[PDB]
Design a protein around this ligand. Structure first.
Ligand SMILES: *[C@@H]1O[C@H](CO)[C@@H](O[C@@H]2O[C@H](CO)[C@@H](O[C@@H]3O[C@H](CO)[C@@H](O)[C@H](O)[C@@H]3O)[C@H](O)[C@H]2NC(C)=O)[C@H](O)[C@H]1NC(C)=O
Ligand SMILES: *[C@@H]1O[C@H](CO)[C@@H](O)[C@H](O)[C@H]1NC(C)=O
Lengths: 629, 277, 305
C-alpha cells in the first residue's frame, strides 16, 4: 500500500525475452505493453505477490511484428490491483552479430575464394534469419550481391566466388548485413595480387620496446631467419632505418648496413650521431612523439630467394611507464573513504607487472600490481564538500628520480538530501577472478549516525550483457555496520558484470543507491581440443596417413581448414581469434561510465537501468543510442 | 524476333516478382534464387513459390529463334499445381529441336485487395467479350455462331470448350439480338471447394437469358478434364432466386460469370438439331 | 508550443498542434524539443484537455464551447473529423461520433442545399480573414460535403441517402464554380471537389488562373494566407497526383517563413502539415527510376536484356 516500484532495462531489443522486477514496498498485478498512437495491444502478463516471497515479481515476457520499419518508443504499464504506473522506453533494431571467415589471405587471378558466415544472437547462441552479402572492388562500386537464408543449418553458411583471369589488383571487400536492419554492416578484407610462395621466414626484433633518448649505445636490433621445416639458414642481409611521423616517412641514407647471417643471427646497432645528423633538430627533447622503424632484406648464398621483413612503431620516450584512469569512479564519497584503482602499462600498451605506485601527498600508502597491471588504493576524505584533486606517481626502486611518470585527477561531490550519504564498495583484493571461484561482496556501510536502527534490508541486482541476470535480497538486524554476500562465480558471468544496490528510508521520501564494476577472466565457455592421436613415433613422410583426435562438448559441429604456413609470411592481417569475439561483444554495451553517478537518478540511469515509483520519484529519460563521446 | 506465349492479362500498374533468362540445353539448370527446375529432351518444368503477400497476375515467355509454327492451335505453356490468384504454380513448357533460349517474367499485385474484374469485363460488354473477338450473329434467326479460329475441344456431341491464353470458356445457351447487360459476378480463391453454388436474382425484369463462364484451372496432363457446370433444377418464372452449381474434378483458382438479361425469354431456346438424345 | 487549456475553442487551438506534432514526429521523432523533457507532461496535458472537451458535451450529442452553448455545424464537424483521425489513437467512442454525425445529417439539412451553422463567430483569431459574410455559404457547403465524405468511411450503412445528397450538392455547385473571387477558398473547395474527382479541364484552368501571377494564391490582407494558400492546391494536386504546380507551391511556402500559432492557426497549419505528410510519404527525396535496356549482337541468336 505505501509504494510500488518497477525496475526495467533501459533499452529493450525486439524479438527477444525481457524481464521486470516488481517490488511492492497478497495482491494480483498485471503488466501490459502498448504502442505509441495506440496500435491495439502487444502483450500482457498476470502475476500474484506473496508475503512469504518478500513481494518480488520476476515478470518475464517475449517481445514480438513487421510494421516496425526514425527511432521509436513503446509504453509499458502495470496495474497493481488498484493503482497504475507507466513508463515510455525506446526500441532499437540491432538483433545479433555476423562473423566472416576466409581460408586464405592473398590470392592470384584465376583462383577461387571460399568463405563462411556464422550468425549468433545477443547471448551468443545459434539463430536463423535472412542475410545479404555484397562484394566490393577497390573503388567501391559493388560487383556481385546476393541474398541467403540460414534456416535448418544450425548457423553456418558456406559460399564461393571465382576471380576472373583479367581483373584489377589491390584490396577487395566483403560486406554482409541482416535483411531486417540495413543500418548496421559487417565487413572483411582480402588482397588480390600475383606472387610466388617463399621458402623461409625472417624475424627482426629489438632488445627494448621503447628508446630512452639519453642512452649512448643507440638502438640495437637482432635478425633471425629460419627455414619452414625447422632447419637453420645462412646468407647475407641489408638493413636500413627510418623515421615515422604522423602520416610521414623520412629515410636516413647514411644508415645502411650489410651483415653476414650465419646460423640465423645478426646484430645491428644505431648510434646517436647518425640519428641527430639525419634530422635538423639539435634539441633532443623535440624528438619526443616521433617513432622509428627498421627494414631488412635477406639473400641466400645460392642466389635463389629474396625475403623482406619490416618492423614499425618503436616509440621515442623518456619515461618507461605510463599511468591511466580509465576505470576509476569520478564522484567521491563524503565522510567514507574513497577507493582508487590505477592502471600502469608499458609504452606499447602491454600491461606491466610488479611495479609499485604511491601518492606524493601521503606516505607508505603503496601497493603492487598483479598480472593485469592494476593497483588498488584508498584515501580518506576531509570531509568538507570542497572538491579535491589527487595525484599519482610511480615509486619504482633502482631507478633515477627524474624518470618517474605521474598525473593528476579531479573528483566531484554527491548531492544527497538530509545527509543520509550511504555507499557500497567491496573490500576484497582485486585479483584475477576465475569462473568456479567465490567472491565476498563486503557492504562497507555508514548510515545516519542518529537513528540507524530502522533499516531492515537492501536490494541488489547483477547486470551483464545488457540484461538483468539476477536479483537478490539481503537483510540485517539493527546495530550492524558490515554484512557479506558470498557470491558463487559461474561460467555465465564472462566477461564482466556490474553490481547495483539500493535501499529506502522513511523521512519525505529517501532512496539511496550505488554501483560497482567488476571483471572476470575471459575464455570460451565450452572447450575444443585438437591433437595427434598417432603414437608420435617420428616425423611423417609425404603421401603417408596419420590420425587426428578431437575433443569437445557433446552434440556440436566442428569445421576444419588447413593452410600452408608460407602464406602468412606474405600477409598476416585480419585473422579470427577469440579475443576478437570478446572485444566485439564488449564494445557494444549500454552503460559506459564506471558508476557512482551524481545522485540516485544518476546511478540508476548510468548503468542502463530504469526505476519507476508510484510516488512520482522516477528517473530522467534518454532517447539517443550511444553515450556521449 | 522470337515467339511469345502468354498467361493472363497485363496491366500498367504491376510490379515484377522475378525476371530471368534460361538456356535450354544445359544439364542441369543453373539454380537461380534458390529455385528448382527439370530439363529433359522434350520438357522444361519450373517450381515457383513466393514469400511476400501477393497474388499473381500474368506470366509471359519469349523464345528464340523464330520457328515456322503458329502458337494458338495447341497448348505449350501450362502450370500444374496452382494458377492465377494463388501465390504459386509449377510451370511446364514443351520444347522443339530448334529452341535454345528462354526469357521469363512474372507480375503480381498486393494480396489483400486484389481483384481482376476491372480487366476482363472490358469497356463495351455488349459488343466485345473478354477474348477480344466481337460477337457476330445470324440475320435469319438471331443466334450467335461459333468462333472458329481458336483451340476448341469437345467431350461428346453438342458440347464446346474453347481455350485461349490460359483462359477457358463455356456458353450455356444461345443469344438473341435484343439482350441487355445487367452486371457481373466474381468468385475469388478463398470460396472455392470441390463442389459449390451461387445465387442469382430473377426478379421481374432481371430475367436470366444467357450465361457464359470464364475460369482458370490446373491440368495434370496435356489432356484436360473439363468440369460439369449443370443448371440445378429448372429456372422458370416462378422460382425467383436461381442457383448455379459447379461439379469439378480438378481445383480451380478463379471464376467469372457475365449474366445477360432479356424480358422476352420464355426459358427454352434450342437448335433444331440439338434436341434428340 | 501552445499549451492546450481553457474552454472548448481554446482546447481546440491547443490540441490541433498536438495532432500536427504527432504526425510530424511520426516522420521525425523529435518529441525532445516539445517542452525540454516535457513530452510525457505534454501528453498528459493533451489527455486532460481531451477529457475536458469530452466533459463539455451536450444532451444534443454535440460538442460546443460550453455545455450550455448552442451547438454549431462547424465546430462539431471539426471535432468529429479530428476524432475520426484519432479513433485508433486515443479513447474515442465510435458510437458517440456516429450518433453525432447522424444527428448532424437529420437536423441541419436545409432544403435550399446550402448549409449554415447556428452560432455566429465573434473573434477573428481562429477563423482568419473571412469574417465578412459574403461567400461563406459555399465554403460551409464544401465543409459539410467533406464531413459527409469522412463519415462515408465511418457511418456508411446507418445513412444511405449520402450519394443522393452528394449528387445534389455537386449539381447545385457545378454552375456556381464560376462565381467566386477569393482564391484560397476556391482552392480548398476545389480540393474537396477533386477528393471525389470532379475538377478537370477548363475548371482546372480557371482554378490555376485564379491565383495571382499564376503561382501565389494571395488575398488582400492576412499574410498568413501565404504558407496556407498554395497548401490547399497541393492537397488538391495530391488528389490529382499532379506534381507540376506542387513545386511552385513549395517555393511560395518557403518565401514567408512565418512562425504562426494562435491567430488564424486552426485550419491552415493542420492542412499544410498533413499535406507535407502525404507529400513526403508518396514523394521521398528520390524520384521514380525504372529502366529497361536491351542490346543485340550480330553473332548471337538472342538478345541481352
Ligand atoms: C523429363 O521430365 C519430365 C518432367 O520434368 C517428365 O514428365 C513427367 O514424368 C513423370 C514421371 O513419369 C510423370 O509423373 C507420372 O505421372 C503419373 C500419372 O498417373 C503418376 O502415376 C506419377 O506421378 C508418375 O510419376 C509426369 O506426369 C510427367 N509430366 C509432367 C510432370 O508434366 C518426362 O517424362 C521426362 N522425360 C522422359 C523421357 O522420361
Ligand atoms: C425452381 O423452383 C423449385 C421449386 O421447388 C426449386 O426447388 C428450384 O431450386 C428452383 N430452381 C432454380 C434454378 O431457382
Amino acid at each position: 500500500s505505501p509504494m510500488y516500484s518497477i525496475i526495467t532495462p533501459n533499452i529493450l531489443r525486439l524479438e527477444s525475452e525481457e524481464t521486470m522486477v516488481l517490488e511492492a514496498h497478497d495482491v494480483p498485478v498485471t503488466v501490459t505493453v502498448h504502442d505509441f498512437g495506440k496500435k491495439l495491444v502487444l502483450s500482457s502478463e498476470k502475476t500474484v505477490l506473496t508475503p512469504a516471497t518478500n513481494h518480488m515479481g520476476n515478470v518475464t515476457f517475449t517481445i514480438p511484428n513487421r510494421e516496425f520499419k526514425r527511432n521509436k518508443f513503446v509504453t509499458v504499464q502495470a496495474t497493481f490491483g488498484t493503482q497504475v504506473v507507466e513508463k515510455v522506453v525506446l526500441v532499437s533494431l540491432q538483433s545479433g552479430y555476423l562473423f566472416i571467415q576466409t581460408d586464405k589471405t592473398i590470392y592470384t587471378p584465376g583462383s577461387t575464394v571460399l568463405y563462411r558466415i556464422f550468425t549468433v544472437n545477443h547471448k551468443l547462441l545459434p539463430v536463423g534469419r535472412t542475410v545479404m552479402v555484397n562484394i566490393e572492388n577497390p573503388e567501391g562500386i559493388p560487383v556481385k550481391q546476393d541474398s541467403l537464408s540460414s534456416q535448418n543449418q544450425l548457423g553456418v553458411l558456406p559460399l564461393s566466388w571465382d576471380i576472373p583471369e583479367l581483373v584489377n589488383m589491390g584490396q577487395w571487400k566483403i560486406r554482409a548485413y541482416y535483411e531486417n536492419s540495413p543500418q548496421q554492416v559487417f565487413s572483411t578484407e582480402f588482397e588480390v595480387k600475383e606472387y610466388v610462395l617463399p621458402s623461409f621466414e625472417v624475424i627482426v626484433e629489438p632488445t627494448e620496446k621503447f628508446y630512452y633518448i639519453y642512452n649512448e649505445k643507440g638502438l640495437e636490433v637482432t635478425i633471425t631467419a629460419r627455414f619452414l621445416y625447422g632447419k637453420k639458414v645462412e646468407g647475407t642481409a641489408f638493413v636500413i632505418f627510418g623515421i615515422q611521423d604522423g602520416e610521414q616517412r623520412i629515410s636516413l641514407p647514411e644508415s645502411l648496413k650489410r651483415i653476414p647471417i650465419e646460423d640465423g643471427s645478426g646484430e645491428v646497432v644505431l648510434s646517436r650521431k647518425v640519428l641527430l645528423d639525419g634530422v635538423q633538430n639539435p634539441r633532443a627533447e623535440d624528438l619526443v612523439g616521433k617513432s622509428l622503424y627498421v627494414s631488412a632484406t635477406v639473400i641466400l648464398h645460392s642466389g635463389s630467394d629474396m625475403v623482406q621483413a619490416e618492423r614499425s612503431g618503436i616509440p621515442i620516450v623518456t619515461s618507461p611507464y605510463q599511468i591511466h584512469f580509465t576505470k576509476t569512479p569520478k564522484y567521491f564519497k563524503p565522510g567514507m573513504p574513497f577507493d582508487l584503482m590505477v592502471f600502469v602499462t608499458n609504452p606499447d600498451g602491454s600491461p606491466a607487472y610488479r611495479v609499485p605506485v604511491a601518492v606524493q601527498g601521503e606516505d607508505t600508502v603503496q601497493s603492487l600490481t598483479q598480472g593485469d597491471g592494476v593497483a588498488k588504493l584508498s584515501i580518506n576524505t576531509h570531509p568538507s564538500q570542497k572538491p579535491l584533486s589527487i595525484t599519482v606517481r610511480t615509486k619504482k626502486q633502482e631507478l633515477s628520480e627524474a624518470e618517474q611518470a605521474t598525473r593528476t585527477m579531479q573528483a566531484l561531490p554527491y548531492s544527497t538530501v538530509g545527509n543520509s550519504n550511504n555507499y557500497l564498495h567491496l573490500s576484497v583484493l582485486r585479483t584475477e577472478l576465475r569462473p568456479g571461484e567465490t567472491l565476498n561482496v563486503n557492504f562497507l556501510l555508514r548510515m545516519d549516525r542518529a537513528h540507524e536502527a530502522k533499516i531492515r534490508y537492501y536490494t541488489y541486482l547483477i547486470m551483464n550483457k545488457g540484461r538483468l541476470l539476477k536479483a537478490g535480497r539481503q537483510v540485517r538486524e539493527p546495530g550492524q555496520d558490515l554484512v557479506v554476500l558470498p557470491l558463487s562465480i559461474t561460467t555465465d558471468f564472462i566477461p564482466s558484470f556490474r553490481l547495483v544496490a539500493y535501499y529506502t528510508l522513511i523521512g519525505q521520501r529517501e532512496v539511496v543507491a550505488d554501483s560497482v564494476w567488476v571483471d572476470v577472466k575471459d575464455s570460451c565457455v565450452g572447450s575444443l581440443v585438437v591433437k595427434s592421436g598417432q603414437s608420435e613415433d617420428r616425423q611423417p613422410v609425404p603421401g603417408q596417413q596419420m590420425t587426428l583426435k578431437i575433443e569437445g562438448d557433446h552434440g556440436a559441429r566442428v569445421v576444419l581448414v588447413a593452410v600452408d604456413k608460407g602464406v602468412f609470411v606474405l600477409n598476416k592481417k585480419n585473422k579470427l581469434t577469440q579475443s576478437k569475439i570478446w572485444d566485439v561483444v564488449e564494445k557494444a554495451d549500454i552503460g559506459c561510465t564506471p558508476g557512482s553517478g551524481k545522485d540516485y537518478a544518476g546511478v540508476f540511469s548510468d548503468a542502463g537501468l530504469t526505476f519507476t515509483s508510484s510516488s512520482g520519484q522516477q528517473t530522467a529519460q534518454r532517447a539517443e543510442l550511444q553515450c556521449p563521446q | 524476333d522470337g515467339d511469345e506465349y502468354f498467361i493472363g492479362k497485363y496491366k500498367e500498374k504491376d510490379e515484377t516478382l522475378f525476371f530471368a533468362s534460361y538456356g535450354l540445353k544445359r544439364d542441369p539448370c543453373q539454380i537461380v534464387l534458390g529455385y528448382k527446375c527439370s530439363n529433359n529432351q522434350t520438357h522444361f518444368v519450373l517450381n515457383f513459390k513466393t514469400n511476400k503477400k501477393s497474388c499473381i497476375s500474368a506470366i509471359k515467355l519469349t523464345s528464340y529463334p523464330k520457328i515456322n509454327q503458329n502458337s494458338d492451335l495447341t497448348r505449350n505453356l501450362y502450370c500444374q499445381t496452382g494458377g492465377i490468384g494463388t501465390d504459386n504454380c509449377k510451370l511446364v513448357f514443351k520444347k522443339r529441336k530448334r529452341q535454345i533460349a528462354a526469357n521469363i517474367e512474372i507480375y503480381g499485385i498486393p494480396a489483400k485487395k486484389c481483384s481482376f474484374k476491372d480487366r476482363y469485363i472490358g469497356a463495351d460488354p455488349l459488343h466485345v467479350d473478354s477474348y477480344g473477338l466481337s460477337y457476330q450473329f445470324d440475320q435469319e434467326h438471331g443466334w450467335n455462331l461459333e468462333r472458329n479460329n481458336i483451340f476448341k475441344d469437345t467431350r461428346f456431341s453438342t458440347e464446346v470448350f474453347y481455350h485461349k491464353n490460359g483462359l477457358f470458356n463455356t456458353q450455356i445457351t444461345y443469344l438473341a439480338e435484343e439482350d441487355s447487360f445487367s452486371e457481373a459476378r466474381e468468385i475469388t480463391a478463398k470460396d472455392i471447394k470441390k463442389k459449390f453454388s451461387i445465387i442469382l436474382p430473377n426478379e421481374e425484369y432481371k430475367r436470366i437469358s444467357f450465361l457464359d463462364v470464364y475460369w482458370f484451372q490446373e491440368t495434370m496432363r496435356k489432356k484436360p478434364k473439363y468440369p460439369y457446370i449443370h443448371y440445378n433444377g429448372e429456372c422458370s418464372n416462378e422460382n425467383k432466386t436461381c442457383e448455379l452449381v459447379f461439379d469439378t474434378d480438378e481445383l480451380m483458382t478463379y471464376a467469372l460469370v457475365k449474366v445477360f438479361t432479356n424480358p422476352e425469354s420464355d426459358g427454352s431456346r434450342l437448335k433444331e438439331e440439338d434436341l434428340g438424345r | 508550443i501552445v499549451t492546450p487549456s481553457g474552454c472548448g475553442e481554446q482546447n481546440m487551438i491547443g490540441m490541433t498542434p498536438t495532432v500536427i506534432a504527432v504526425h510530424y514526429l511520426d516522420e521525425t521523432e523529435q518529441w525532445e524539443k516539445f517542452g525540454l523533457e516535457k513530452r510525457q507532461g505534454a501528453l498528459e496535458l493533451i489527455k486532460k484537455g481531451y477529457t475536458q472537451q469530452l466533459a463539455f458535451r451536450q444532451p444534443s450529442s454535440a460538442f460546443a464551447a460550453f455545455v450550455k452553448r448552442a451547438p454549431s455545424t462547424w465546430l462539431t464537424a471539426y471535432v468529429v473529423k479530428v476524432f475520426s483521425l484519432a479513433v485508433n489513437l486515443i479513447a474515442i467512442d465510435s458510437q458517440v461520433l456516429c450518433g453525432a454525425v447522424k444527428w448532424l445529417i437529420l437536423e441541419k439539412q436545409k432544403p435550399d442545399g446550402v448549409f449554415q451553422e447556428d452560432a455566429p463567430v465573434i473573434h477573428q483569431e481562429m477563423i482568419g480573414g473571412l469574417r465578412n459574410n459574403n461567400e461563406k455559404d459555399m465554403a460551409l457547403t464544401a465543409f459539410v460535403l467533406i464531413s459527409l465524405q469522412e463519415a462515408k468511411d465511418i457511418c456508411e450503412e446507418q445513412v444511405n441517402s449520402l450519394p443522393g445528397s452528394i449528387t445534389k450538392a455537386g449539381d447545385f455547385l457545378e454552375a456556381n464554380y464560376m462565381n467566386l473571387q477569393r482564391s484560397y477558398t476556391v482552392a480548398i473547395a476545389g480540393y474537396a471537389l477533386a477528393q471525389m474527382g470532379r475538377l478537370k479541364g477548363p475548371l482546372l484552368n480557371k482554378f490555376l488562373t485564379t491565383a495571382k501571377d499564376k503561382n501565389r494564391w494571395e488575398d488582400p490582407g492576412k499574410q498568413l494566407y501565404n504558407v496556407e494558400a498554395t497548401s490547399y492546391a497541393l492537397l488538391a494536386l495530391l488528389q490529382l497526383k499532379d506534381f507540376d504546380f506542387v513545386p511552385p507551391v513549395v517555393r511560395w511556402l518557403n518565401e514567408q517563413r512565418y512562425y504562426g500559432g494562435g491567430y488564424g492557426s486552426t485550419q491552415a497549419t493542420f492542412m499544410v502539415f498533413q499535406a507535407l505528410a502525404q507529400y513526403q510519404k508518396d514523394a521521398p527525396d528520390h524520384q521514380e527510376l525504372n529502366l529497361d535496356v536491351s542490346l543485340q549482337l550480330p553473332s548471337r541468336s538472342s538478345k541481352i536484356t
